[PDB]
Design a protein around this ligand. Structure first.
Ligand code: NAD
Ligand code: MG
Ligand code: MG
Ligand code: MG
Ligand code: MG
Ligand code: MG
Ligand code: MG
Lengths: 58, 309, 123, 49, 255, 248
RNA sequence: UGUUUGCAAUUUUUUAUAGUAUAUAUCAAAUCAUCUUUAUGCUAUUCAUAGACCUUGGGUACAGUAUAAAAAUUAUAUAUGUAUUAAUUUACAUAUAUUUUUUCUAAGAAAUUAGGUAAGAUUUUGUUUAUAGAGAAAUUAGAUGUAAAAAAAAAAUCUUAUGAGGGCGGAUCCGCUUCUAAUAUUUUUUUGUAGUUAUUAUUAUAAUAAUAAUCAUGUUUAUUACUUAAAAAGCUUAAUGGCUUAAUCUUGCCUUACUGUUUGAUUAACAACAAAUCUUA
């Protein structure tokens, strides 16, 4: 008699994510924040944007 | 046509869509209220059992896709933007970047037995046991070529934390379990230590961590949160080491507690965890690839920088 | 303790004896889900065949190009197969700088940014 | 028309409970006579037990 | 509000709700899904008309034109026919009412869609049981060298369904049983029923012998027929009884 | 059907997932807590902002489906509710902000840009949901940037040089490798010399094409979609490159 | 009215009707603790009602973009402000508690439980690759390959048959035996290797040929079958043998680790006897 287990999943919300470029997309997460603004991300990082001079400080 | 005659004529799929006047009279909330009674129950009262007792037991369980099943998980709620990205732009770039041409009439490659047999005239060779794997004691998987039928993709991700100090302070394990809960959206499973070490105060067979596993869309979303919100916020981050790789298409790398609290799910309620209790983690990205150079080529296609190590 | 009791309450609602029970559908409700589950898995089959048809057509266009190229004498005095043998080389394909990170890092988005495209980019 | 069906539902249940109680009555009666019976048999030395 | 309408819940729901076909219930996702399957059924039907005509051309085509000849012409029509039989099932395997109609037993077994689902149902539970009985009771190889059943057979004695391999009292099995058969391939055929006792002890030679307890041939059957009473194989049902029902029996002491 | 199916599944997750514990994310009697409790009551107890109103418990949990023509499942309605829930409704002091003094959040940008409205075919911010292809006119036939392969270079070294000699160096481009993704053959006229064109794939990440001082006799350029190439490129030129196209 | 509220959907059984064994309904049990107040409360608005912003309250709302019309409703002891009435009656408002709704301090975070039976799982050791803290030594994740539309036909070699009750002698036993059938074997004589999707070529969207892909009507975390040397791990304790298709592991329900008598063996246990071991009814 092998047990048939049930899934134990917490409440998940639908969240809007606004990157630093002003672009937006929707995700699925456990945090209740409806809009997540991101000031620092891959769109504003020199390791991901090696050809962006605005972010280049020499 | 006689073939069209054998089809069902009372086709419900070929019916017209509903009407508006009849849609304005459809009020499920008013039926129950205006009924002033409870409808009799249906005589069909099969319910999935808590245990599976065999393929021939009178009471059988339904598949997990059945909504009444106990294993049912509601389906997709959205399309991860990183799976759509890969399937839309990158899949053709890997297929174009990694392409070797086979002329039309090239005979198929017959694989050779990796556990060799003794062949010869010596009478002893007949019943000899197959030889051992040449080189390593375990056979490594052979690399499949990247073609329009084998595009390496991401399958699942395992996050784990090892907290040996939890044996002294049991609160370190409750907090570690709540971070992996919010970081992943799953319920982690506690792990135990397996070796005794007196210098490290490590006793065996005692709970000393937890682990999660997210599949399908949840794994693609976790990579989007990681590649684009977490890793860019680590101070003086050089990249994923180029040494990572188990030789079978899987990538591993670890984070610090100062980098686990950068996750939007952990930094929103950072004040609900005691101080100096948020742990680090080991993240194992399991891909459909078949080599270390294919898995590294796949992560580069998703925006993962590597540094020589 | 008060902060840890709050964690334990989060694990209590996730207990197998407190989580909501398995669904109970009537017939007309069970058949409506069976119809939705049957159309979703059909929609996925259509998206799959389409997805895989285009990949096979891109692959055949590559094969027809690399098959002609394999039987081209030139340019000039270069012998048959030269360009073909130079196209099949994988130099730098499996290194660190294979795919530029400015191209892979730009994942899709539901709505564009304040500046969708940068026409003023200079070398 | 729904009250009639419910009365038919209640009647079928109340009817069963009545016939189910009548059957339980007879069972408890048969168990009372069986557990009360005493068969004394001639075993040996002209003794009964 | 009579029993002819169905269960109490139906008779009760059929009077407290509206008269609207199940396929027209104005639910958002139920209708969007209905449109996906409606547009797919029209694509399968269009494919049946395309492969149907493709066979006419191949039929008119003389074997001399085929590189393999008549052999290569039949292997190509055989594959188109099978492909057609698969599209006729896929054109209705997504219909919610075809599923309801089948689950209610009101399905037309003269059509491939309902025979396809009847066999699938049979091969889920009842086939695995009969398969296990054939092996554990050694019906194979004793009676037949190999046996893979392809139709359902449920026998009953005086209205009481008996489980496969059950020990039945001699008084119960004194009358001929009633077979509840179900075939899953189209057309009419003639069946032959044989009841054989495999463990008749022959003390004279210290071995077991076989004994027929019933034999009948020329029993016409179609996938729409359900019940067959072996008592009525001569008068009501068309057939040729070679041996009427002999009450099964077992002498004392034998297994 | 995707919008209806997601919404249909987000409500099944309401009936099967564990409840939401606000005490795990908001400290009692604070600015965040009071803001949550106000907007929670307007949703009638539903902690989610994109499934309308539905209670997984009670005598009404069976009525989880919406009817035809329901704006609740649309992608425009959920974004409206996610933005209406991001505005802070309680000042840091703890008092409700008036209905007029509330700051609306910056709304997302539209999918169709200005170029989509004007129809500028020289713009790369047009048709953002599709793939754009660079075709150039040579003093006149529209085509892709081509050039003869010298005895010194290969196919991938010529394509990189031709592109710079055809559209400038102000484009952040990436030749996807050395393999040609398409080819076009022009048979010889027995006479005239035939041509065996081999196309390599390229991706542009930033910049714009420039036809000033080009070595090849190029006049104009434009960035077209797959449906537009079919009307601009020749019938034989198009039949040979269309196998290289993508889904979008 | 147990069972999800729009409608004959699991298994067996009871009863009733029609019917001559079947058909439908119904009942019970098994499988499963799904939570159920049709509103009595809340919310918005308006008015009486003081009057410089108050109690108490009377109406209004018309519900698929479902709704104010239930996001979760119990009960009690003490004391207090307001008001009440023939009342510490009532409601209100708190504070102090005690309470049911099991629904909020993770046993699916713990214990190495070793026998019977049933189901399920099938390399678990070591080695090795990689992996925040992490080091010689801590945890986690990995480490074989194949197949999954479908065959058809002719002969030969045996071997089997409670197949033809085959034939000839001494239906069933024995010796000879012909035929048929089945498994296996041949590198055997072969035939076929499609359809679907697309590509290329030709021909006038279709036909033909060639090439490539193709287990897939199915919640890809696919699934299923076969395969993956030896040693090692595990199996109450040494060593040897054995088990991986169970004798290991997991889970459910259990206590046959039962009572009496008894068979045949250990080439007539230990080169006797006895205490023993295995086994049958
Ligand atoms: N899954 C199958 O039934 C199936 C059938 C035949 C072949 N394959 C093979 O499997 C591989 C691909 O598997 P797949 O086609 O099943 O992948 P898939 O992406 O369609 O399915 C995997 C996951 O993606 C989700 N998903 C699919 N479409 C979605 C959408 N529009 N929005 C949100 N989520 C969505 C699915 O629900 C599932 O969770 C290929 O090799 C393919 O040929 C799969
Ligand atoms: Mg798909
Ligand atoms: Mg190991
Ligand atoms: Mg180390
Ligand atoms: Mg044991
Ligand atoms: Mg047990
Ligand atoms: Mg002796």
């Amino acid at each position: 008699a092998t047990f048939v287990p049930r899934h134990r999943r917490p409440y998940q919300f639908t969240q809007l994510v606004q990157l630093s470029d002003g672009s937006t997309f929707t995700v699925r997460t456990t945090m209740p924040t409806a809009l997540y603004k991101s000031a620092k991300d891959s769109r504003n990082h020199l390791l991901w944007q090696p050809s962006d001079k605005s972010l280049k400080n020499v | 046509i006689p073939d069209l005659a054998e089809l069902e004529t009372r086709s419900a799929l070929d019916a017209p869509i509903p009407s508006e006047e009849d849609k304005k009279e459809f009020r499920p909330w008013k039926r129950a209220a205006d009924r002033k009674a409870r409808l009799p129950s249906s005589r069909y009262q099969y319910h999935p059992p808590k245990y599976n007792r065999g393929p021939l037991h009178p009471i059988q369980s339904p598949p997990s896709s059945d909504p009444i099943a106990r294993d049912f998980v509601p389906g997709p709620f959205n399309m991860p933007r990183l799976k759509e990205t890969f399937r839309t732009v990158m899949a053709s770039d890997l297929m174009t970047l990694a392409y070797i041409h086979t002329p039309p009439g090239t005979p198929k490659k017959e694989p050779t037995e990796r556990l060799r047999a003794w062949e010869g005239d010596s009478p002893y060779f007949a019943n000899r046991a197959r030889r051992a794997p040449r080189g390593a004691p375990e056979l490594p998987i052979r690399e499949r070529d990247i073609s329009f039928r084998n595009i390496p993709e991401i399958k699942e991700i395992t996050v784990s934390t090892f907290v040996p100090l939890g044996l002294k302070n049991p609160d370190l394990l409750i907090v570690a379990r709540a971070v992996l809960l919010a970081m992943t959206g799953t319920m982690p499973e506690m792990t135990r230590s397996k070796n005794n070490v007196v210098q490290w105060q490590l006793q065996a067979n005692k709970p000393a961590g937890c682990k999660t596993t997210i599949y399908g869309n949840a794994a693609w979303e976790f990579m989007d949160r990681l590649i684009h919100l977490v890793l860019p916020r680590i101070k003086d981050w050089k990249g994923v080491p180029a040494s990572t790789g188990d030789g079978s298409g899987n990538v591993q790398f670890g984070l610090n507690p100062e980098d686990v609290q950068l996750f939007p799910e952990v930094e929103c309620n950072y004040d609900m965890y005691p101080a100096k209790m948020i742990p680090g983690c080991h993240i194992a990205i399991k891909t459909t690839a078949t080599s270390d150079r294919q898995a590294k080529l796949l992560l580069q296609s998703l925006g993962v920088p590597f540094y020589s190590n | 303790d008060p902060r840890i009791i709050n964690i334990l309450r989060h694990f209590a609602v996730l207990s197998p004896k407190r989580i909501p029970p398995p669904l109970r559908f009537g017939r007309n409700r069970y058949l409506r889900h069976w119809t939705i589950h049957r159309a979703w898995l059909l929609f996925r089959r259509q998206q799959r065949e389409q997805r895989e048809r285009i990949l096979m057509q891109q692959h055949q266009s590559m094969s027809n190009a690399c098959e002609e190229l394999r039987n081209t004498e030139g340019p000039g005095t270069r012998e048959t197969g030269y360009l073909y043998r130079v196209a099949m080389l994988k130099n730098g394909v499996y290194g660190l700088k294979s795919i530029p990170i400015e191209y892979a890092s730009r994942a899709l988005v539901e709505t564009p940014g304040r500046q969708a495209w940068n026409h003023e980019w200079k070398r | 028309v729904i009250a009639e069906l419910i009365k038919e539902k209640l009647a079928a249940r109340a009817e069963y409970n009545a016939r189910q109680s009548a059957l339980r009555k007879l069972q408890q009666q048969k168990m009372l006579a069986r557990r009360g019976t005493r068969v004394l048999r001639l075993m040996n030395n002209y003794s009964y037990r | 509000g009579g029993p002819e309408l169905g269960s109490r819940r139906r008779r009760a729901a059929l009077a407290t709700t509206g008269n609207l076909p199940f396929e027209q219930l104005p639910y958002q996702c139920f209708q969007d899904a209905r449109k996906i399957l409606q547009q797919d059924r029209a694509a399968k039907i269009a494919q049946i008309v395309k492969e149907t005509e493709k066979i006419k051309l191949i039929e008119a085509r003389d074997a001399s034109e085929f590189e393999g000849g008549e052999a290569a012409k039949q292997t190509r029509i055989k594959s188109l026919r099978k492909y057609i039989e698969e599209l006729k099932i896929l054109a209705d395997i997504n219909d919610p009412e075809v599923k309801r109609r089948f689950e209610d037993g009101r399905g037309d077994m003269t059509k491939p869609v309902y025979r396809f689902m009847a066999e699938r149902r049979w091969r889920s539970m009842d086939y695995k049981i009969i398969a296990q009985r054939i092996s554990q009771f050694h019906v194979v190889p004793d009676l037949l060298p190999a046996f893979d059943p392809t139709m359902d057979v449920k026998l009953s004695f005086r209205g009481y369904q008996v489980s496969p391999g059950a020990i039945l009292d001699s008084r119960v099995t004194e009358v001929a049983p009633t077979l509840r058969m179900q075939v899953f391939d189209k057309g009419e055929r003639l069946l032959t029923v044989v009841v054989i006792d495999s463990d008749v002890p022959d003390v004279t030679h210290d071995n077991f012998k076989r004994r027929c307890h019933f034999l009948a041939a020329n029993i016409p059957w179609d996938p729409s027929k359900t019940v067959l009473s072996l008592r009525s194989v001569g008068d009501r049902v068309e057939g040729d009884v070679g041996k009427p029902w002999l009450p099964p029996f077992a002498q004392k002491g034998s297994p | 059907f995707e919008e209806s199916f997601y919404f249909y599944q987000k409500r099944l997750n309401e009936r099967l997932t564990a409840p939401f514990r606000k005490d795990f994310y908001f400290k009692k009697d604070t600015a965040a807590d009071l803001d949550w409790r106000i907007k929670l009551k307007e949703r009638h107890g539903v902690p989610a902002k994109d499934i309308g109103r539905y209670n997984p418990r009670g005598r009404m949990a069976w009525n989880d489906e919406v009817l035809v023509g329901s704006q609740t499942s649309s992608r425009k309605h959920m974004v409206e509710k996610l933005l209406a829930d991001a505005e802070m409704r309680v000042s840091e002091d703890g008092e409700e902000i008036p209905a007029e003094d509330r700051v609306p959040v910056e709304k997302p940008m539209p999918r169709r840009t200005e170029a989509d409205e004007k129809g500028d075919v020289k713009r790369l911010d047009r048709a953002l949901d599709k793939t754009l292809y660079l075709v150039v006119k040579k003093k006149a036939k529209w085509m892709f940037p081509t050039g003869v392969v010298p005895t010194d270079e290969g196919l991938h070294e010529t394509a990189a040089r031709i592109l710079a000699e055809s559209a400038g160096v102000n484009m952040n481009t990436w030749i996807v490798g050395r393999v040609p993704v398409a080819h076009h053959v022009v048979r010889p006229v027995f006479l005239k010399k035939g041509e065996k064109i081999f196309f390599l794939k390229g991706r542009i990440m930033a910049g714009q094409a420039d036809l000033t001082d080009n070595l090849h006799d190029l006049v104009d350029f434009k960035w077209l979609t797959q449906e537009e190439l079919r009307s601009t490129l020749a019938e034989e030129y198009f039949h040979s490159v269309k196998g290289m196209f993508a889904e979008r």
